[PDB]
Amino acid sequence: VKKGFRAAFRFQKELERQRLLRCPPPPVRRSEKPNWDYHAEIQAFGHRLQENFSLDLLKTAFVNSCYIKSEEAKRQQLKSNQELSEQGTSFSQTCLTQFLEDEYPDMPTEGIKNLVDFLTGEEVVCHVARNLAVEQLTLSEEFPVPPAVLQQTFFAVIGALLQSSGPERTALFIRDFLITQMTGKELFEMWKIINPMGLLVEELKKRNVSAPESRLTRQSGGTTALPLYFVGLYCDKKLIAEGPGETVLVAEEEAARVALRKLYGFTENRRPWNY
């Protein structure tokens, strides 16, 4: 039995850390994790995003409705979230539609509705919410905070900002925190469509141009299991697209996607957003 304490204690702390990885702790809220102070951390939220919220409006944006119900249920042995959430949703939908109209004037209203729905969807607002740390400052039913409540809370924060310091700064907020979420993605993984050749056909009927022809522009390996086909979409001796595929049908329909991108102007080359 070797005399001493430093090494025995070093080993004991090492076993404690191996335990903390093997059985990770059950996730419980930062609000009751130590070193917390709500008022200062509200003010830190404000100065981090660098505009002034009215503090009471911001707090009542964070406090939910289900939390109020559960707090009464706890109390039996406050103004809610919802008005702020409705204002924030209304304004975010309207100015997201405005920004995307002014930058993409040719895109149809169904496409721009799909863009706005994508930007205000569950997954993107969940990620922007968590990586903006409203997920810590909100008050909800359980940890982790459910994504519907996160979306509602984030739009309530936007509504509090709207009532606080005006539509221009609120539009800057929506722009700089929701349109950056589409920088990098594509139109047809933001607006999920089916039968893209059909969409091309009806949209050209709106354009009063003849229905396009498909042609097989280039190919390789036509009789193995690794073919390449560029199918081009032509209209009256000239093309609007050409696209790749592992077979003729996939190539044709992907060239239809390319044609739809080029017609709506939402290509890969488009003039990047003016931040």
Binding site: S214, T217, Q219, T224, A225, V231, K238, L239, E242
Partner: protein, 73 residues
């Protein structure tokens, strides 16, 4: 193959390249017309590779495999 329009400025200070997309004309297009041993050999002849691609690897290599790799771009 090279078909571009090159130029200088007047000063002789910067070069200008002009080079747009040449398209594929309509006429240059065709229209669309509408046992383990045998196993590994027919895979090899179907994919123009050899059989050592298809013979397995043990639990040890499959455990050194990464299963959640980083993703870019």
């Amino acid at each position: 193959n090279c078909n571009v329009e090159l130029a200088l400025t007047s000063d002789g200070r910067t070069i200008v390249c002009y080079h747009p997309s040449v398209d594929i004309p309509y006429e240059h297009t065709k229209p669309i017309p509408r046992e383990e041993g045998p196993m590994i050999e027919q895979l090899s002849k179907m994919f123009f590779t050899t059989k050592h691609r298809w013979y397995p690897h043990g639990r040890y290599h499959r455990c050194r495999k990464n299963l959640n790799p980083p993703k870019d771009r």
